[PDB]
């Protein structure tokens, strides 16, 4: 449905989600700290996306239930 | 049989179902935690040169933005799911509102107390 | 804040805050100036008693209703009635409350425009909305289809509705109502010797009609029975003694509804204008309208009308359809209960005619999108 | 006693003392405390919250069926817990939806009588021919080949 | 994965997954906007009811078919119908399923190209293929030769096939079909007093046609019999009562098929366009076509047509040839059953129009080798 519009929205949100940081301005311990921080951030990403998938599954089951019940109407 | 007996057995069945649901929810919570642990790989940054760890972090950043894209995909899909859920709720509510329109109101507010002032 | 669900009506003004079960204050809509001279000094005699106060001093007043048939014929008196309703029966200043008036179908435009102009200029309400008196009565029944016969005291109108889509070409408005029945009863009481003439005694005849009259299931059999036995003669005590005995005037007064030829009206009764209103509808929604016939309004409270009407319609309608007549016990306040429900809805909260909109388009805003 | 003492605590010992005082108010009094039987009708007349005829039928079945001429303190409090509003609010629509989804392991959009039997027997309760078949007569009102969604959603209305 | 065998048709959309016996969801293809005003607020009134939902609220809608005669005249409504079919009647997203539409012979190119462009851009299917509605009906009969007369509701076409080699010069497409029979029945019912005008009452006349009409074995004898006795008058109950009695309108409505001069059409009946379609074929395959005449489509379900058509063709054809008319009981869904069989074949699995091919050649790919 106007996939150009959807891609524009995707670009805007991804630019919001876009994170580029300094890569050559930290020492070894700072570098390791940043690596660990990125690991924990993407770990939160994994957990949240697992939540997204599970809630999508639950929602899809409810959609099946509601569709079945409205078909049981007639 | 007696209506009270059937009601009590139904109540027991519902309580057991709720207990099973809570146990399965605990199981799913633990399983999700463990699997999410499996998705994330351990990081050993000790004895890492600036270039090596810098490249590793840049790879992690690229993967992070990939995760952002995939989350955008699943979030668009889940918004579609929520939209169709709202549509199903609307249609079912309309079918029930063939016979349930004025069901939302409040009655007997303040006049039923005022009786003898006249 | 809360909305004021006023309902002008014609004969009883019913008002109250939105969201309750029953109107807070119900009182006749009459304004009566004194007519005699008055000799006591300093008695504190006012120049016009309105509302329920003039039903207690009616012995020396000349009561006159400000609403004849739905339409309003005397705007100053109607303004006085509204002022009384807001300030003394509810004691809430209108500057802080939306209002939801009600209006009969097919009424003159000027009446509605003047009503909104008064509400916005004199009382200065925040926002007011005018609704058709039958859709509310359909709200109160909890239905969404059905053909509602709202036989008030001023005018009887019959609005069919299906699935929420009103059918504007099938509204049959008839001007026979409770007031004409009161006049006809007052006219047939003279056949026994009781003469009521004064505008105050019209109230006594109205009380007789309310307490004694009933609708006969079969008219000819009742006329024959009342002319042989004497099991029908019920007596009633006037406000001063001298009990009276009503014979076959009991079921002849409300029979005028089904035979408007009694008071010289040409049209057909309320039993046949409903069938005509149905037959103007499309061929596929006639079964639902047959099954969900709704009664409302005060005058449909006669004991035994929900059976006479069903018998008549079953005689007219095809033999296969099922005829059902919904007659809730809270018939009199059905319109106001529906008004409260409608004003309490969240979806309706943006349909009010906001004051800035009126300032931009004048009183003719009511005919526009904000209906 | 689990359901019975749960009902006891529903009208707890404070409510027990309140109703004991009310009983002393409406009882015959000036007696040995032998406890009458009509006292459950006397309280029905007294409190204004008259028990429903169903509650009176339950009382007749439980007591006075053998000509006791008295109502037992346990049975009196049984009737009292039958009069005061110890409602369960019929759970919630979402809770019913979850429970029915778990009953619909088959995800058929309805519950089968086999599903009913399995869920009941997962509780350990004796589910014999006196059940299911009675529930076919009673639990499933429609009996139109299965237990449809509104059938069991509305079946558990105002229940625990 | 599995293929979606949709079949647009004109009057009933039939769809279902490939490999079954009957279509999963069959529902009329009508999209009806409401026409009255609508007074109930918050009733959840939509702007267009499509499919089988608009056959229940047809009392306040204006139903309009989006397909007139095979061709599609209103592309937005057709897109709405397809969207409903995919998402609500089958509940399978089209992003993961090939589709197999069907199209009448000799239709405008632009219709087919727009159909494929919609399926590839809006619904974004993996691959779609368009097939002629008669070859499928020949698949379903399990034959490989024969001349199939597929008298649908939009258009009647007659495609002869021999040994799998279609004869493109012998296709006789005639635009008389079920819809014209409905209109003619609605026009001859007025001779008794029953007037159906509204687009909603066309559905009632269609039901009358389906349940009562039959094809007479001999027309003049039936006209003479119905004019003397009264053994034919069958009654039918409208959706509101008032039963009607159909006399010799019973076999006069479907007689239009064999005498298109009744509705003013010049061409010859379906009994003579089949013989003409045969005679255009070569002289050596006429016996096989005579022996394997196939009937399909909804309108060929009239009781007694498989005998009238055989009698007519036997009258026309040479006396030596044997005339046999194949009329399977599953006539209505014959095209869709054949579509399922064709989509389930392994040899056919590489004929789909893959999306990358469409991206390289545009919508005009359908006329190319991938037919
Ligand atoms: N209990 C009753 N029995 C018979 N007639 C009644 C009764 N109550 C009211 N009426 C008639 O109905 C009229 C009141 O109708 P109402 O519904 O108040 O009119 P409106 O629509 O103007 O509010 C009175 O004038 C009276 O004649
Ligand atoms: N049992 C029946 N008897 C007579 N006519 C029928 C019957 N069923 C369907 N029809 C006619 O056939 C039409 C349906 O034809 P159909 O084969 O669905 O067309 P399409 O080829 O567009 O699918 C209907 O409009 C109806 O007029
Ligand atoms: Mg009224
Ligand atoms: Mg077809």
Swiss-Prot record, chain B:
Q: Where is this region: Involved in binding TNC?
A: 1-39
Domain of life the protein comes from:
Eukaryota
Instruction: State the Gene Ontology BP annotations.
Output: cardiac muscle contraction; heart development; intracellular calcium ion homeostasis; muscle filament sliding; regulation of cardiac muscle contraction by calcium ion signaling; regulation of muscle contraction; regulation of smooth muscle contraction; regulation of systemic arterial blood pressure by ischemic conditions
How is this chain modified after translation? Phosphorylation by STK4/MST1 alters its binding affinity to TNNC1 (cardiac Tn-C) and TNNT2 (cardiac Tn-T). Phosphorylated at Ser-2 and Ser-4 by PRKCE; phosphorylation increases myocardium contractile dysfunction.
**Which UniProt keywords are given for this protein, alphabetically ordered?**
Acetylation, Actin-binding, Muscle protein, Phosphoprotein
| Location of region: Involved in binding TNC and actin | 89-110
Residues with site note (Involved in TNI-TNT interactions): 40, 57
Recall the GO molecular function terms of this protein's record.
actin filament binding; calcium channel inhibitor activity; calcium-dependent protein binding; protein domain specific binding; protein kinase binding; troponin C binding; troponin T binding
Q: Which residues carry this modification: Phosphothreonine?
A: 11, 38, 89, 103
Q: Which residues carry this modification: Phosphoserine?
A: 2, 4, 110
This protein's GO CC annotations: cardiac myofibril; cardiac Troponin complex; cytoplasm; sarcomere
Purpose: Troponin I is the inhibitory subunit of troponin, the thin filament regulatory complex which confers calcium-sensitivity to striated muscle actomyosin ATPase activity.
* Subunit annotation: Interacts with TRIM63. Binds to actin and tropomyosin. Interacts with STK4/MST1.
Q: Which family does it belong to?
A: Belongs to the troponin I family.
Protein name as annotated: Troponin I, cardiac muscle
From Swiss-Prot, chains C, E:
Q: What is this protein called?
A: Actin, alpha cardiac muscle 1
The cellular location(s) given in this protein's UniProt record come to: Cytoplasm, Cytoskeleton
| Similarity annotation | Belongs to the actin family.
Q: What does this protein do?
A: Actins are highly conserved proteins that are involved in various types of cell motility and are ubiquitously expressed in all eukaryotic cells.
Give the main EC class: hydrolase
What Enzyme Commission number(s) apply to this enzyme? 3.6.4.-
Keywords in UniProt for this one?
Acetylation, ATP-binding, Cytoplasm, Cytoskeleton, Hydrolase, Methylation, Muscle protein, Nucleotide-binding, Oxidation
Gene this chain is encoded by = Actc1
Residues the record lists as N6-methyllysine modifications: 80
- What's the superkingdom here? Eukaryota
From Swiss-Prot, chain D:
Give an example GO cellular component term for this record: cardiac Troponin complex
Q: Name one GO molecular function term.
A: protein homodimerization activity
The UniProt record gives the binding positions of Ca(2+) 3 as 140, 142, 144, 146, 151
Listed transmembrane segments: none
InterPro entries for this protein: CALM/Myosin/TropC-like, EF-hand-dom_pair, EF_Hand_1_Ca_BS, EF_hand_dom
Keywords from the named record: Acetylation, Calcium, Metal-binding, Muscle protein, Phosphoprotein, Repeat
The identity of this protein, by name, is: Troponin C, slow skeletal and cardiac muscles
Query: Which top-level group of life is the source organism from?
Result: Eukaryota
Which family does the entry's similarity section mention? Belongs to the troponin C family.
Which function does this protein serve? Troponin is the central regulatory protein of striated muscle contraction. Tn consists of three components: Tn-I which is the inhibitor of actomyosin ATPase, Tn-T which contains the binding site for tropomyosin and Tn-C. The binding of calcium to Tn-C abolishes the inhibitory action of Tn on actin filaments.
Q: Give the misc comment.
A: Cardiac muscle Tn-C can bind 3 calcium ions per molecule. Domain I does not bind calcium.
Q: Which GO terms describe its biological process?
A: cardiac muscle contraction; diaphragm contraction; muscle filament sliding; regulation of ATP-dependent activity; regulation of muscle filament sliding speed; response to metal ion; transition between fast and slow fiber; ventricular cardiac muscle tissue morphogenesis
| Binding-site positions, Ca(2+) 2 | 104, 106, 108, 110, 115
Q: Which gene encodes it?
A: Tnnc1
Residue ranges of domain EF-hand in the record: 15-50, 51-86, 91-126, 127-160
| Residues at which Ca(2+) 1 binds | 64, 66, 68, 70, 75
Q: Which organism is it from?
A: Mus musculus (Mouse)
